[PDB]
């Protein structure tokens, strides 16, 4: 138990505030095909769905002995190790959210008629629109909004490409859990960073495949 | 022997009380196709059956000199590195539960007659049910029952999509001896934690391949 | 926070003046097909556009505790690991540039009446041609241009081919954010030199797959 | 020659009791196929042959400054470093026995009336059945026998699928020969255990590929 | 800056005598194949051609602290890093040569009535034939010449098999810049040896594939 | 210099006898296929042929800093590093034999009238003949004999199978030249042991592929 006073003492000089949300796998699926509901309120298409957040303290590391103190995140694109504290077993799946820590995406989707209508689903925790604009240049604050984390642009818009800059709240979700018996005990996670898991919806839909951008993308894989 | 007597107070100051089963290939295998027997209650149609389990104390290790003190649970999801003795030899395929510890899991089914009549099996040691649901939301305890590790929903969810989390026992498989030669003399172990080996019942079944969720899930390979 | 002014120092210490461009994904696209613009002014065919430049300091390694002091630039052509501060979130794909490092390159073309009309673009900050020739010796100065990063030849040179070196502006594109959660706090970016992402136009075109050059390169892959 | 006095004193210090057979390849091929005889006294069908087996000390170890003091057994199942002394050149396939060690394996077969009047060749060492049993439940001892390492059943037990666990003897076999130019001088071999080369005869045979068991096994590969 | 001084003054205290060439894409590609011209004098069918060549000194080595000091030659053969001072930023694909250093070579080719004409191109800076035959002897020195790096024999030897090795200058070809914001300054160049990018003629041409030898190489590839 | 008289001194303190033997390409070929002759007295059908052996000395070894002293030969079969001076260029495929150490090797032919009356080549350097048999038991002196490195069976033998073991002299050929520009100055060679390159020849041969043995070997690949 010395081992384990250690490590509540880590989490507490080297821990930060996040959100704990306790995921699922969403069941909105198509019997028939296997795939969530698109405009699903729960999953948003994606298949997991979560529970109310709740509040802990999570130390949050990309070198540790247990890894040569090699840098994981430069080994595996988006991965961490996080230690945290918990009334209730942490899963795989789960997401945690850093408040406080703002991380930047780029996207760009062809504007159909049902885009307009449904809104296009960004699937980060939007906070601000750093650029928008079309081939036509900046998209001005009263032709879009952003609501229940879509981008609503103005019907004039239709058939235009919409490039997109934006600022969103830091998650992670789970991949793993590790030193499962060691050890509110501490609780030790591998973890994903969300830019390496979400998927933007296609630029073009097919009514067959859909069109992806033909750009070569300097972002880690 | 004095690298024996400094192992077996490793397993003495370490260890954690564990319970082993002695495993068999389960004889229920159907000649013609060579794959268990769905509902065999030794295997669970797994084709793996276990003798009664017996109490032992094993040490469980992440980090080692002989991984160079790297975490082969990272290098490898669910491998860890079990040390313990015991009066008979351990082998392959073995498995160890450590019943002071629940893990997680999450699973979803698509429930047809079948499941209603004969129950979906969980193939995990389950401790409690922490959430479960169809797309109609909550099932309410009267409407569902945990036997023999299997879910027995009430008819009225024939035809419904049911989503499930648990709490488990943590348990593993053995895959490997180590150390054959060297030293009850202390019995070295390559585990495999239970959540990497157990593949659930698909998601529905076809008369043809059995359809899975179609659903990007982060849980480590 | 003691770890924060460490890293600001080095930054400060180590770190050379660099210019960034905000990068977003440009919507010259073609509805059609996903393509850039050939000629886009943005992206000159690439499909990622930049705003304005801003000046900054960013320490740049190519070693560190992070990667066991090993030579990522070794490990993986083109990589290196920068830190800086900025007032605004670095994004992926965004460009560094280093205006007091100038580098090298090589490229051949095929000049057709197309690109004797509309210039071969070179994609570089172009700085200096250290040389130029066709099969038929040396192109003297009055018979080219360079303008807007593009060979302008004299019509005389129409169904040569042109072959080319420069000198250019170092740049890089970020591939990654690092140390998201840790820490104007420093950002730590994992960056990937220019020459490795920029493809040179095809050596001749068809009208069908264009035709590369036909040649053992042994610049690292 | 004080690398080699080092060396044999080590053998000496740390090596245990173990036997020698020297290998070579049995000359019972089938010319047609290139095929051992399925029944060979002397292979058994392995097409590698033994003559009679001698005693010497070996030491066995899995870490060493040679692997950076990994586990290599943990690197590769199955695999170890054995060091010697011995009047002849031991050679590649060559079998060392640790009489002293018991290791563990299960195997399970379908019995056909061929199975019943030649038994099932085991290919260990056997030196107990801890676990015998069909569908129909135990198989008493009276019901079979254990002849020249065949399982041999009593008829009844035709068409039934028999399970067995077992005791056999610690067995390698040669892989290589390491440090053949330095230094009866010691000789340092690279040990395969038995039990990662020895296939068991397949579950049911085909008159076609024979059926193996459609079970997932966690036994290292 | 104090950095820079310690590698200027290895370059001083290690470095050894070297031409450097200026390197670039050879304009005599065929338009209609992107092949270089076979006897094309500036590259000699291979694509790439220099400028005259330069003195300077360059410390090689194939083990440092950025490399594990692993020995990255073992790692990949004809690898070596390359330190040197120079007036012109030096580039990919840029030739250095040792000229002090004699390395070995050995070929073969069916000898056409082709090659007795135009004489076999050897492509290496040849200083010296150690040896050379045909299935029918040693070849005397008034029955060939070597002349701009090229195997003249007397036409006696048409449609006979010629086997030589040779001694030839040590040169190598840059595949990387490393280091370069780093830092006349320190260039840092990742070399590869002549004799693992050079592809000799083939053993005969077909009028289809060219036929090379069926012999087992263990050169390094 | 000094690195140099280091490096003299380890051969010499560390250097064993060995032979050198001068490699080049066996002109034998023939023009049509690009396979040697199958029994050239240069190369044995092999395509690589010797000149004269010459005596010199040289260090042997499997680990060293530049391989962070893991045992090359374990992590590469039949890998060593050869340290030597000689007063000539020493060249890949050239061959070194350590005359006072015997090497092992199994090997086993179906003996076909052609094998009776052209002997069987074994390639190595034969030094005894430990084991030899047929399906029949063993073969009697009188009955065999080796010549020039072949096995002459007596007539009563064709249409027999004949296993065999042997000792032969340890022997390597030259994989790479090492620190090529570093330093009769010392020479450094990755080493290739014989017995990873020589292929025997086939068990039966077809008049369509040739027959191998179908047999699970445990030598290392
Ligand atoms: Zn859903
Ligand atoms: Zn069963
Ligand atoms: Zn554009
Ligand atoms: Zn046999
Ligand atoms: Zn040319
Ligand atoms: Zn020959």
Request: with cysteine; hydrophobic share 35%.
């Amino acid at each position: 138990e010395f081992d384990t006073i250690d490590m509540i003492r880590f989490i507490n000089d080297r821990g930060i505030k996040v959100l704990w949300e306790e995921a699922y796998f969403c069941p909105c699926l198509n019997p028939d095909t296997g795939h969530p509901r698109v405009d699903c309120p729960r999953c948003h298409g994606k298949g997991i769905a979560y529970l109310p957040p709740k509040e802990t303290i999570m130390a949050i590391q990309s070198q540790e002995k247990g890894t040569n103190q090699l840098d994981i995140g430069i080994l595996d694109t988006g991965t961490a190790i996080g230690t945290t504290q918990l009334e209730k077993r942490i899963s795989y799946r789960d997401r945690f959210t850093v408040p406080e820590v703002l991380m930047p995406q780029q996207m760009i989707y062809f504007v159909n008629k049902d885009r307009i209508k449904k809104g296009i689903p960004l699937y980060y925790d939007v906070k601000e629109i750093t650029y928008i604009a079309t081939q036509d240049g900046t998209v001005y604050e009263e032709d879009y909004e952003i609501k229940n984390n879509r981008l609503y642009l103005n019907e004039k818009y239709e058939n235009h490409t919409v490039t997109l800059k934006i600022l969103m709240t830091l998650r992670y979700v789970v991949s793993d859990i590790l030193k499962e018996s060691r050890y509110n005990l501490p609780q030790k996670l591998l973890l994903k960073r969300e830019d390496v898991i979400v998927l933007q919806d296609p630029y073009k839909v097919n009514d067959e495949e859909d069109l992806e951008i033909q750009v070569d993308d300097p972002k880690a894989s």
